[PDB]
Amino acid sequence: PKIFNLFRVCFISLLLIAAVEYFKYGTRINYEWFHCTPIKEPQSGSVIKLWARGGPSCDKRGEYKTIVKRITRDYEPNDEHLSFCIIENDNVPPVHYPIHEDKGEPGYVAYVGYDTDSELVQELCADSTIYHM
Amino acid sequence: PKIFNLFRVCFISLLLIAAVEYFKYGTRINYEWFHCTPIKEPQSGSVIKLWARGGPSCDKRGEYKTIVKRITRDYEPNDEHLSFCIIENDNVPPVHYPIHEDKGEPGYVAYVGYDTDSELVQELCADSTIYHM
Amino acid sequence: IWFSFREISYRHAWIAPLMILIAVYSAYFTSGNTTKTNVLHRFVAVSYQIGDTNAYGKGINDLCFVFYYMIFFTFLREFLMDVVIRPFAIRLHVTSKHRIKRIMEQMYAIFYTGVSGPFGIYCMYHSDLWFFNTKAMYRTYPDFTNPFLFKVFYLGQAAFWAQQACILVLQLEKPRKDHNELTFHHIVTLLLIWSSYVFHFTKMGLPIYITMDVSDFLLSFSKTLNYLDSGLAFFSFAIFVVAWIYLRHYINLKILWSVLTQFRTEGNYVLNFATQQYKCWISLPIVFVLIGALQLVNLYWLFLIFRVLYRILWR
Amino acid sequence: IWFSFREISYRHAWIAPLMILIAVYSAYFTSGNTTKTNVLHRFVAVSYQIGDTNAYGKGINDLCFVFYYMIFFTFLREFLMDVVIRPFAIRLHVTSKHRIKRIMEQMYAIFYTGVSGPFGIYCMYHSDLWFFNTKAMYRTYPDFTNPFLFKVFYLGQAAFWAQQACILVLQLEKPRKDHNELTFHHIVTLLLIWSSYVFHFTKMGLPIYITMDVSDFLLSFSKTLNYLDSGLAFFSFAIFVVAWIYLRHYINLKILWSVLTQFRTEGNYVLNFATQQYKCWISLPIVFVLIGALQLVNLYWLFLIFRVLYRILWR
Ligand SMILES: CCCC[C@@H](C)[C@@H](OC(=O)C[C@@H](CC(=O)O)C(=O)O)[C@H](C[C@@H](C)C[C@H](O)CCCC[C@@H](O)C[C@H](O)[C@H](C)N)OC(=O)C[C@@H](CC(=O)O)C(=O)O
Ligand SMILES: CCCC[C@@H](C)[C@@H](OC(=O)C[C@@H](CC(=O)O)C(=O)O)[C@H](C[C@@H](C)C[C@H](O)CCCC[C@@H](O)C[C@H](O)[C@H](C)N)OC(=O)C[C@@H](CC(=O)O)C(=O)O
């Protein structure tokens, strides 16, 4: 009765079970890293324009998630304080992307920049609310 | 010259090096799980009010990050489409929390709900832009 | 009395698992709440009934259920094996060692396999899969919810084959005989059950053992009638060979072909991690490879069947 | 000629590391860009110079530097040991086996240790830490940037002690003698260097070996003059014991006390993962425990020193 051989086999089986369940959970909660790829559009001195484009699994919240994570971990506010604006495309259904590469207008566009040029963010973000950070 | 003993010792040393560097990186990029704790305030049928409270390391973007992740992974839009609004406290400096427990007004408050009750979100979010999802 | 209890547990092999499961059942059935608000319930029944309908979710209580019924299925095997299959090995004249050991093994195989065959067929009967319908496999794919009989069928198979595989690696006695094919079978069966349940390929899972169980019933019946020399054994073996050729080859080939063609065509085929549906072009390889592994094992086995068939035919 | 090269590498031990590092240096110094845009530069020099100033960042090129200089420090030890310290062991009359082995070891210790002592003192001189100032340790904590001499001092120590520890685990010869205290010393030294550099406790790291290096210089000088019987050995040992008592006890006790008191009081003491500053109440335990480990080792060692001191005093 070699108990330890059993014990190690069962303990590694449970380890695969837990690993695959973590795979499922993780790929669910932050799926936007898989389906959505964030586009950075350069601009004048310190501002950029954000959005995302993917397949039909890149819905509006995939775009919002990826845009806000790009905004919040591409800009260090401890060095200099930033300022951003997010504008939503109000005539495009939430799930709106085609499988192919003629996708069109995104669901969300966001303008983000540092506070050296905050009037530039004022200009690019027309009359939407402007979030400070 | 027992080479393999060396090889395993060096390979586990490099493994600790990589593990601790991942510790540093991970705790940096998503620090808001450590410093910021998100407060849910119940409301009428399907809406809630969001914000965060922590120490001086829970700055405005810690609150924005934790609020948007609560909004985006506490609400499944594939079942029913939601609608949210984020309102910023425009007279409180970005880094504004005391070490002690008399902290006061947060940097950000967000209202989020389902589309059964979207006029309720209209009511709670006074005149700020309302994001669909 | 602890020593005497150990002595009786040495003269039997079912006393301790029987005590474990009878204690669990008695404690659970002591009056109270025989509902989802009890740990023994997560260990005695399928949990996560969605609302109050015939749909069941997944969770860790599934693993608790599986392991408790491994504990149970040890008791079913030891009790049946000794208490029943030794009398049916002695009260009928049989005179050998390998002959009696394998006659016990084959009749226990007959028992559990003829229990699990008709139950699988019934589960497939009152469903849209009737007589191996390859489109109901993929019509509504993500299948987060399984019916009561269907879920319990899946978790009983998991408990049974896990118990087989763990007594395969805890070598009590009988060191080595067929264990290469046996270990490949056990590992592949357990991986397919687990990966079929976890990744929602569940209505895909029912038809494939249905075939394995009813074919194994026929095979074990043929070998039992070989042991108990009757002269009707060759008739049962011909019935077995035609049933094997039908089920394990034609039905599984149809199922593979079903994968290849109607895995794309039917239902949902756009990957979506948020919706948690994995039926895409990335999982078609994995599914086809597992089905192919099962088919390769069955191909080697009918090579063996036909080798024996022709040698006996001219002998 | 490959066999003859192996024979010369068997009659020496520095030929192969010398070839490796001379090839790397020659390839790097072949005309081109002797700047940060070269892999050999990440293997030959400290990288991540911030802007064009005397501040240096961290990265993987640090590990590349450390391992390349492990390769180098193997060549320094083998070349010095053989080519120099065997003539200084033979040209001066010494007649034994353990006597000559340990006389080589102690004079090599004298060499590297008296090289690393004054360099550490110089690094602490042109800094705000002068003569062990316990407040410049914590004034500007996060210290993502280290000066040139200070960073190269930290990475040379890492390469040297890592090479020591790897030839400790690759047992060539001389199986067992003092290896319990030796392995504790090597593991603790390497962990403190790595954890001090990685977690920015870097200006905290300079004063602590300064003490270890200059004290080890004095100790090895005393043991060398013991070997080479001179009669001046006891004078050097008294100087060593007073320097040990001063440095490794008073300065490290002051540094520990500095941790306990001015780790909170001085600089930044609010944990902030975003800013990447770990100087909080969670790291004070770790720092104090490492310093305490070093102090326990030095306490056992002066128990040994004084045991020898009094026995020789009345012998
Ligand atoms: C008229 C009836 C007489 C029965 C006759 C046909 C018998 O062939 C002989 O007539 C005997 C001589 C032939 C001769 O030379 O005269 C020979 O076959 O050995 C038969 C042939 C066999 C090679 C078929 C495979 O076995 C089955 C294993 C398949 C997979 C299954 O396991 C599924 C899975 O695992 C799990 C349970 N779901 O069965 C045996 O022979 C077995 C051996 C066992 C042994 O030796 O291993 C034995 O008979 O007990
Ligand atoms: C007037 C001058 C004569 C020298 C005299 C004091 C000598 O004591 C004796 O006079 C000889 C008899 C005494 C007697 O009985 O008469 C006895 O001490 O053994 C001395 C005592 C010694 C116990 C001190 C520790 O060693 C040092 C190791 C500390 C940590 C260091 O390593 C740092 C670190 O690792 C790294 C390098 N940074 O040194 C030895 O003795 C060593 C033994 C070696 C051995 O046996 O292991 C030997 O002499 O070579």
Swiss-Prot record, chains A, B:
The keyword Phosphoprotein does not apply. It is a single-pass type II membrane protein. Changing residue 57 to F: Does not affect LAC1-LIP1 complex formation but abolishes enzymatic activity. CDD domains: LIP1-like. It comes from the Eukaryota. Changing residue 64 to A: About 95% loss in enzymatic activity of the LAC1-LIP1 complex. Its main location: endoplasmic reticulum. Changing residue 85 to A: About 90% loss in enzymatic activity of the LAC1-LIP1 complex. Residues 24-133 are lumenal. The chain crosses the membrane at residues 4-23. Disulfide bonds join 36-58, 85-125. One of its GO terms (cellular component) is endoplasmic reticulum. Hexacosanoate binds at residue 23. One of its GO terms (biological process) is ceramide biosynthetic process. It is found in: Endoplasmic reticulum membrane. Keywords: Disulfide bond, Endoplasmic reticulum, Lipid biosynthesis, Lipid metabolism, Membrane, Signal-anchor, Transmembrane, Transmembrane helix. Belongs to the LIP1 family. Component of the ceramide synthase complex required for the synthesis of ceramides. Plays a role in the localization of LAG1 to the nuclear endoplasmic reticulum. The C-terminal domain probably plays a role in its function. Component of the ceramide synthase complex composed of at least LAC1, LAG1 and LIP1. Forms a heterotetrameric complex, where one unit of the LIP1 homodimer interacts with LAC1 and the other with either LAC1 or LAG1. This is Ceramide synthase subunit LIP1. It comes from Saccharomyces cerevisiae (strain ATCC 204508 / S288c) (Baker's yeast).
Swiss-Prot record, chains C, D:
GO terms for molecular function: sphingosine N-acyltransferase activity. Hexacosanoyl-CoA binds at residues 161, 185, 189, 192, 195-196, 201, 204-205, 208-209, 212, 216, 219, 223, 226, 237, 248, 278, 282-283, 286-287, 290, 301. Disruption phenotype: Does not affect the level of total sphingolipids. Exhibits weak diffusion barriers only in cortical ER and not in the nuclear envelope. Double knockout of LAC1 and LAG1 abolishes growth and leads to mating defects including defects in diploid cell formation, pheromone-induced shmoo formation, induction of cell cycle arrest and activation of mating-specific MAP kinase. Also defective in the localization of STE5 to the plasma membrane. It is found in: Endoplasmic reticulum membrane. Changing residue 271 to A: About 90% loss in enzymatic activity of the LAC1-LIP1 complex. As part of the ceramide synthase complex, inhibited by the sphinganine analog mycotoxin, fumonisin B1 (FB1). Activated by ACB1, as part of the ceramide synthase complex. Induction: Expression is controlled by PDR1 and PDR3 which bind its promoter PDRE element, and by ROX1 and CBF1. Changing residue 116 to A: Does not affect the enzymatic activity of the LAC1-LIP1 complex. Changing residue 223 to A: About 80% loss in enzymatic activity of the LAC1-LIP1 complex. Does not rescue the growth defect of LAC1-LAG1 double deletion mutant. GO terms for cellular component: acyl-CoA ceramide synthase complex; endoplasmic reticulum; endoplasmic reticulum membrane; nuclear periphery. One of its GO terms (biological process) is ceramide biosynthetic process. Hexacosanoate binds at residues 154, 161, 185, 189, 192-193, 195-196, 199, 201, 204-205, 208-209, 212-213, 216, 248, 273, 278, 282-283, 286-287, 290-291, 301. Changing residue 226 to A: About 60% loss in enzymatic activity of the LAC1-LIP1 complex. Does not rescue the growth defect of LAC1-LAG1 double deletion mutant. It catalyses: a very long-chain fatty acyl-CoA + a sphingoid base = an N-(very-long-chain fatty acyl)-sphingoid base + CoA + H(+); hexacosanoyl-CoA + sphinganine = N-hexacosanoylsphinganine + CoA + H(+); eicosanoyl-CoA + sphinganine = N-eicosanoylsphinganine + CoA + H(+); a fatty acyl-CoA + sphinganine = an N-acylsphinganine + CoA + H(+). Residues 86-102, 171-179, 226-235 are cytoplasmic. The chain crosses the membrane at residues 12-32, 61-85, 103-124, 148-170, 180-198, 204-225, 236-264, 284-312. It comes from the Eukaryota. Fumonisin B1 binds at residues 99, 102, 112, 161, 185, 216, 219, 223, 226-227, 233-234, 237, 244, 301, 305, 308, 312, 315. Changing residue 199 to A: About 75% loss in enzymatic activity of the LAC1-LIP1 complex. Belongs to the sphingosine N-acyltransferase family. Component of the ceramide synthase complex composed of at least LAC1, LAG1 and LIP1. Forms a heterotetrameric complex, where one unit of the LIP1 homodimer interacts with LAC1 and the other with either LAC1 or LAG1. This is Ceramide synthase LAC1. The gene is LAC1. The chain holds residues 71 to 385 of 418 of the full protein.
